[PDB]
């Protein structure tokens, strides 16, 4: 009622006051002395040309060589990036897939989409074929992002405005995170695999502690739908790319907006964002059919990745940081170095 | 220069590519239809003859039609509506008896405006089904059409009101050139409805073929 509305009013007022008090000067003033990275060499080393339809998600294995890609033709394709060979081809029960994951151990993969079911496939079997290890259900909306914590614990983001930490051995939601008011369209796991950020459709991102489950911090400032989130390699920050043609950097300590990567030239939103191994370069896939890589410190366009006919949908960087890979809406993935 | 194991891996990759190509050829001959309604407009009634998304497969005249009923997807439509960009047609169903509902036809018109005038469906045809024609007759025999339609000059006659509703739903389209709207006063009747869809689908396909020939 009215008094609860008023305490919420004063609580967010004092939160904003503390945020502004903890702000003295933008880090653009602290970073202008650093020599800019300049124009970045970018070439198409390999071109994975196996898909036959729209490509919606991808992920890099921890070996930095095998990558799994998901397309609307209902096929999960696991490629050896070094030789562009197709290690595996998995038929999906539901052809509508928008998320994909690769287990840290490499034994399992995850997939999901409009079926509201997260399917976990076992990659290493004595039968010599991939099989659907376990289907997880309980999400009332479409699955947008799923990430592996280990061989047995997964965390999934759905369109039901809630996230869920599951248990593949048993198949029930071990924990449920319900703090959002819109579709949660992305997910990122911190390096320690204890905290994770989720950017939803209410133009806000939220930080959750997977150990027990509750929204530790809420970050706002976006003017439209948030389509991608990605942790900083240090783990004390993250970057969110949204539909308003802006990428934004937040930290888990100051809990404030840091940088607004945007330009008057581009107006299309962001589909995927990922950092580099050192975190100096921040890549962002756009609807303008090209991926812009920005200096994470200078807020300047370090380079342009223009080799895709259609809109870039998924983007990933290998664990060793040796190369990046973009899967656009055309049937081709591309590897850049 | 590749070793024996690398050669065998390349052979396996080639076999996987062949299987992918065969599956793509098999799927490319399947016609996809995106079904949309209003929950009670009669999607079940249209699908009766042949927790997330629902898929229905049916064969007619050696043609495999796949219909994707989104149904209970209670999320943001614009977030996943681009997944269906490329379907052959959009089967939009609506009940004519809903003019004494909720106002419900106003919501149906709003949904039709949103779907038809969407950047993704700039070239996909819309097949409009108007069901509950008998219920429409029963309601119009007692309830005047002007209840939901203040700007209507006509009598309580089925043909006139039905034609007015069809014309007004049709003119909600903005790209009258590159996209066509097909309408059919569906009923229980027989497989005629399916026949209609087939004809419309063939139409779309013909145009698509002429687009591949660049001569359209």
């Amino acid at each position, epitope marked *: 009622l009215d008094q609860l509305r008023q305490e919420a009013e004063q609580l967010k007022n004092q939160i904003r006051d503390a945020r502004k008090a903890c702000a003295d000067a933008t880090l653009s003033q602290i970073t202008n002395n650093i020599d800019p990275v300049g124009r970045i060499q970018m070439r198409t080393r390999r071109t994975l040309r196996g898909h036959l339809a729209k490509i919606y998600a991808m992920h890099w294995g921890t070996d930095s060589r095998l990558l799994v890609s998901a397309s609307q033709d209902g096929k999960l394709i696991i490629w*050896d990036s070094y030789t562009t060979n197709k290690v595996h081809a998995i038929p999906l029960r539901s052809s509508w897939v928008m998320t994909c994951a690769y287990a840290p151990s490499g034994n399992y993969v995850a997939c999901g989409g409009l079926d509201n079911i997260c399917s976990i496939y076992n990659l290493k079997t004595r*039968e*010599g074929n991939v099989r659907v290890s376990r289907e997880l259900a309980g999400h009332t909306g479409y699955l947008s992002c799923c990430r592996f914590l280990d061989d047995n614990q997964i965390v999934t983001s759905s369109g039901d405005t809630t996230c869920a930490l599951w248990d593949i051995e048993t198949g029930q939601q071990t924990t449920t995170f319900t703090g959002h008011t819109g579709d949660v369209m992305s997910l990122s796991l911190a390096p320690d695999t204890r905290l994770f950020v989720s950017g939803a459709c209410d133009a806000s991102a939220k930080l959750w502690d997977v150990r027990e489950g509750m929204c530790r911090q809420t970050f706002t400032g976006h003017e439209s739908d948030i389509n991608a989130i990605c942790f900083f390699p240090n783990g004390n920050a993250f970057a969110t790319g949204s539909d308003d043609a802006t990428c934004r950097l937040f930290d888990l300590r100051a809990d404030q907006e840091l940088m607004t990567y945007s330009h008057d030239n581009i107006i299309c939103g962001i589909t995927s964002v990922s950092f580099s191994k050192s975190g100096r370069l921040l890549l962002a896939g756009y609807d303008d059919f090209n991926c812009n890589v920005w200096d994470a410190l200078k807020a300047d366009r370090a380079g342009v990745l223009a080799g895709h006919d259609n809109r870039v949908s998924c983007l990933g960087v290998t664990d060793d940081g040796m190369a990046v890979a973009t899967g656009s809406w055309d049937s081709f993935l591309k590897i850049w170095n | *220069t590749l*070793s024996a*194991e*690398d050669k065998a891996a390349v052979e396996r990759s080639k076999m996987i590519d062949r299987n992918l190509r065969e599956d793509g050829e098999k799927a490319a001959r399947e016609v996809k239809l995106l079904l949309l309604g209003a929950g009670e407009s009669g999607k079940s009634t249209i699908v009766k003859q042949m927790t997330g998304i629902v898929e229905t497969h049916f064969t007619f005249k050696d043609l495999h039609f796949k219909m994707f009923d989104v149904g209970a997807q209670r999320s943001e439509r614009k977030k996943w509506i681009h997944c269906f960009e490329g379907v052959t047609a959009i089967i939009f169903c609506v009940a004519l008896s809903d003019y004494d509902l909720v106002n419900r036809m106003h919501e149906s018109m709003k949904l039709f405006d949103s779907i038809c005038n969407n950047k993704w469906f700039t070239d996909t045809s819309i097949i409009l089904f108007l069901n509950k024609k008998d219920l429409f007759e029963e309601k119009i025999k007692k309830s005047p059409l002007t209840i939901c339609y203040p700007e209507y000059a006509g009598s309580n006659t089925y043909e006139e009101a039905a034609a007015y509703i069809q014309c007004q739903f049709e003119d909600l389209n903005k790209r009258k050139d590159t996209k066509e709207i097909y309408t059919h006063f569906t009923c229980s009747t027989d497989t005629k409805n399916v026949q209609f869809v087939f004809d419309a689908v063939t139409d779309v396909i013909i145009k698509n073929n002429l687009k591949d020939c660049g001569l359209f």
Partner: single-chain antibody, 233 residues
Framework: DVQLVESGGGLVQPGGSRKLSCSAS????????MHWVRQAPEKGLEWVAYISSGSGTIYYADTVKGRFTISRDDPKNTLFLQMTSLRSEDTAMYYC??????????????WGQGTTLTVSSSDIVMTQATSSVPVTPGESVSISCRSSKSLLHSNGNTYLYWFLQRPGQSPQLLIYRMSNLASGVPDRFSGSGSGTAFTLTISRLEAEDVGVYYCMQHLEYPLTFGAGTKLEL
């Protein structure tokens, strides 16, 4: 589970036209390359033939090239070996080894039960040096194996495997690519080395390690096995 049943044995008068069959039950046999490997009684293993998945690539040993035929029947999960013009040295145990080739795979992981065939009356040379070393439980011995050509490839992986033949049953895979330890095998077996010199230690060796240990090359066809190392006591 995975099961390979081999049949078509017995005694054949020399120069016959017999046949060997191998039924598979428990895995996707259509996507597995299959190897036929013989073993003369008091000798070491020797690769006879191999046929890839999809029957697109077929290889034979030089000793039996033009005399043996290999084929697959995927719908009924069977592997056929046409025998032609048999001679005395063809008398051997026979195995229907399976192998799947992709990045990180473990070829030669499972072995068939074996079938007897008794007939009346540029290759890499792989040497295992010593053939019989006496051991006691609780020890640790470095079995060594030597090749002529350097098995290390430009890719960076040394295509070499070692297997164990325990008394009274089929051989089993111990280590693939000289480093990666195969599934089911305990961590006690560990192998390493370099080009043309490969070693392994059985950390805390005990019983059920008795048998003949074979080192095998896989750089290119034909594949040559070692003489085998006999472990006793």
């Amino acid at each position: 589970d995975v099961q390979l049943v081999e049949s078509g044995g017995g005694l054949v008068q020399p120069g016959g036209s017999r046949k060997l069959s191998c039924s598979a039950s428990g895995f996707a046999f259509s996507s597995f390359g299959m190897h036929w490997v013989r073993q003369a009684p008091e000798k070491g293993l020797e690769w006879v033939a191999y046929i890839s998945s999809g029957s697109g690539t077929i290889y034979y040993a030089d000793t039996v090239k033009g005399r043996f035929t290999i084929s697959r029947d995927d719908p009924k999960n069977t592997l056929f070996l046409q025998m032609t013009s048999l001679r005395s040295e063809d008398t051997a145990m026979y195995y229907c080894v399976r192998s799947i080739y992709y990045y990180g795979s473990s070829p030669f992981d499972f072995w068939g039960q074996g079938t007897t065939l008794t007939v009346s009356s540029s290759d890499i040379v792989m040497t295992q040096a010593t053939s019989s070393v006496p051991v006691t439980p609780g020890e640790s011995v470095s079995i060594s194996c030597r090749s002529s050509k350097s098995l290390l490839h430009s890719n960076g992986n040394t295509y070499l495997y070692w297997f164990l033949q325990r008394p009274g049953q089929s051989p089993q895979l111990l280590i693939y690519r000289m480093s990666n330890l195969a599934s089911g095998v305990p961590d006690r077996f560990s192998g390493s080395g370099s080009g043309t010199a490969f070693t392994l230690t059985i950390s805390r060796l005990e019983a059920e390690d008795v048998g003949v240990y074979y080192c095998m090359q896989h750089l290119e066809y034909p594949l040559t096995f070692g003489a085998g190392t006999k472990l006793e006591l």
